Design a protein that fits this description.
heterohexamer; A little secondary structure (11); B mainly beta (206); C mainly beta (29); F little secondary structure (11); B: 206 residues; mainly beta; five-stranded antiparallel β-sheet; 3 helices; C: 29 residues; two-stranded antiparallel sheet; binds chloride ion; meiosis (chain B); histone H3K4me3 reader activity (chain B); Spindlin-1 (chain B); developmental protein (chain B); isopeptide bond (chain B)
């Protein structure tokens, strides 16, 4: 499955 | 130059940090505020709303020559089936555990034809994903639904400037930028003080 | 760190529709 | 300042004539060019495309306090039946006889809920009429019924170029693809204020 | 000298007009 | 029974 790590830019 | 449907690159400055370089795809130019663009940044799934030509954090904006990819939708009826539906969208965590997020599929994204706009009960901002892939992998459950719709009864809210009070009592503003075609009581707000797109339900209270 | 309001119920022109509220998608139900 | 769905009044200067006031209803703001508004002027049935904030002929634009009228559609199924159909639309002439114009009903108009977008084989610009009234009066015949508009990459938002016989290049924009008739498109030319209706035709 | 819309449109400024098609004004000879 | 006299503004 996908991960939430790619949901938003870090900043 | 119209930049909608183009790939762009620009610098960004977060706080007093270094200028960082970002690439993305311009999805939309908001009609009720044509300074406001909706952008998908490479590698990240959230939709950003930025006044690209006004925002003091944006520099060195250029249109890239590379074309946005266009792939044929694998199952067009499935795409149509999920639009407007509640879903359970499965993600996985660092220990491999499955983490289901409840949300709603809102629309096909503009420009990027295999992507879908989606938002979540526990993260009420606009995201986009290639959900037919999640669906075929078994990671998307489409829930069934349960003229008098609030969004059909009221005068149009789109282009209205919203006002709200912080806990400290000062006034802040934003704009109703969109009404969801498939779900007319669902609206997008862009707040003047933030670059996410927030999703609201118009609810009858009396 | 910006916090979106749970409820929106005002427009600057005073025209927010009587009998309704905009609820953030995270609003309690 | 969102003026879509508002009644407006402004001055207009035609050539070197007097400034004249006109009243109308703002129907739409074109997504591919948000400077371009579609307007129905009171008394007239043609849809006008004007860049109301940029056009040097427009002055003293004001939003009127009056709300646009709404009526409930008299026959909702009939409204849905007409969309995308060829029609024969009867108009009367000065000797009282009726002249049938061949055309096509394109869509429900935005903002003005009982009005319909229609164009004509012999006058290929965008008009709007309360066609349920024409139909009940006996003045509208509804004709019975891989698509180019499904095959091609989206044309909407593209800038068109053409040259007249005298060879100068002129421009315009594909502003809309008809939902009910996907091979039918609306073009707004930079040198005129009507909305023109085009068929996308396969030639090879 | 009233504006006259072109009977056919077959060019985009970016050169991308689709091969094998033409836009014909709804009044085009049929 | 509409007429073309209301089709377009006079100018
Ligand atoms: Cl939508
Ligand atoms: Cl109040
Ligand atoms: Cl349409």
């Amino acid at each position: 499955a996908r991960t939430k790590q790619t949901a938003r830019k870090s900043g | 130059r119209n930049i909608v449907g183009c790939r762009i690159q620009h610098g960004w400055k977060e706080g007093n940090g270094p200028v960082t370089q970002w690439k993305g795809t311009v999805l939309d130019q908001v009609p009720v505020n044509p300074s406001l663009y909706l952008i998908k940044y490479d590698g990240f799934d959230c939709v950003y709303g930025l006044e690209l030509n006004k925002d003091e954090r944006v520099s060195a904006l250029e249109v890239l020559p590379d074309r946005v990819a266009t792939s044929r939708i694998s199952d067009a009826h499935l795409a149509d089936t999920m639009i407007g539906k509640a879903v359970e969208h499965m993600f996985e965590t660092e220990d491999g555990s499955k983490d289901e997020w409840r949300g709603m599929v809102l629309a096909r994204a503009p420009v990027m034809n295999t992507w879908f706009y989606i938002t979540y009960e526990k993260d009420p901002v606009l995201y986009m994903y290639q959900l037919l892939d999640d669906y075929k992998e078994g990671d998307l459950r489409i829930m069934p639904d349960s003229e008098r719709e609030p969004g059909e009864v009221v005068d149009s809210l789109v282009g209205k400037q919203v006002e709200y009070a912080k806990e400290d009592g000062s006034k802040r503003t934003g704009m109703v930028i969109h009404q969801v075609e498939a779900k007319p009581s669902v609206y997008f707000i862009k707040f003047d003080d933030d670059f996410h797109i927030y999703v609201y339900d118009l609810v009858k209270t009396s | 760190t910006f916090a979106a309001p749970a409820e929106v119920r005002h427009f600057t022109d005073g025209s927010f529709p009587a009998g309704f509220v905009l609820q953030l998608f995270s609003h309690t139900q």
